[PDB]
Amino acid sequence: QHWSYXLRPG
């Protein structure tokens, strides 16, 4: 839902 979560799974 947002690119700024990086590599957070999901």
Residue numbers in the entry: 1 to 10
Please quote the authors directly.
Triptorelin is a decapeptide with uncharged N- and C-termini pE1–H2–W3–S4–Y5–(D)W6–L7–R8–P9–G10–NH2 that contains three aromatic side chains (Y5, W3 and W6), and three ionizable residues, R8 and Y5 (pKa>10) and a histidine, H2 (pKa=6.1 in water). In this letter, we report on a decapeptide that self-assembles into either 50 nm diameter nanotubes at high pH or 10.7 nm diameter nanotubes at low pH. The peptide conformation switches from a globular one at pH>7.5 to an extended one at pH<6.5. All together, these results show that the peptide conformation, the peptide molecular packing and the assembly morphology of the triptorelin self-assemblies depend on the protonation state of the peptide single histidine, H2.
To obtain insights into the nanotube structure at atomic level, the peptide was crystallized as used for amyloid structure determination. Small triptorelin crystals were formed in the presence of phosphate anions that are larger than acetate. By optimizing the crystallization conditions large single crystals diffracting up to 0.85 Å resolution were obtained. The high-pH crystal structure obtained at 0.85 Å resolution reveals a histidine-serine H-bond and histidine-aromatic interactions, whereas the low-pH molecular structure demonstrates these key interactions have disappeared, likely in favour of cation-π proximities. Hence, the 25-Å-thick bilayer observed in the crystal structure (fully compatible with the 26 Å determined by SAXS) is essentially maintained by aromatic stacking, as shown by the side view of the bilayer and in agreement with the low β-sheet content observed by ATR-FTIR. The histidine tautomer in the crystal and in the nanotubes is the τ tautomer. Remarkably, the histidine residue is part of a hydrophobic aromatic cluster and its orientation is locked by two strong hydrogen bonds with the S4OH group and the backbone amine at distances (nitrogen to proton) of 2.1 and 2.21 Å, respectively. Finally, in agreement with both ATR-FTIR and Raman data, almost no direct intra- or inter-molecular hydrogen bonds stabilize the peptide conformation or the peptide packing except within the type II′ β-turn induced by the (D)W6. At high pH, the monocationic peptide with a single-positive charge on R8 is coiled at the level of the five contiguous residues H2–W3–S4–Y5–(D)W6 with five intramolecular interactions among them (right). At high pH, H2 is involved in an intramolecular interaction network, that is, two strong H-bond H2–S4 and π– π interactions between H2 and Y5 (intra- and inter-molecularly) and between H2 and W3.
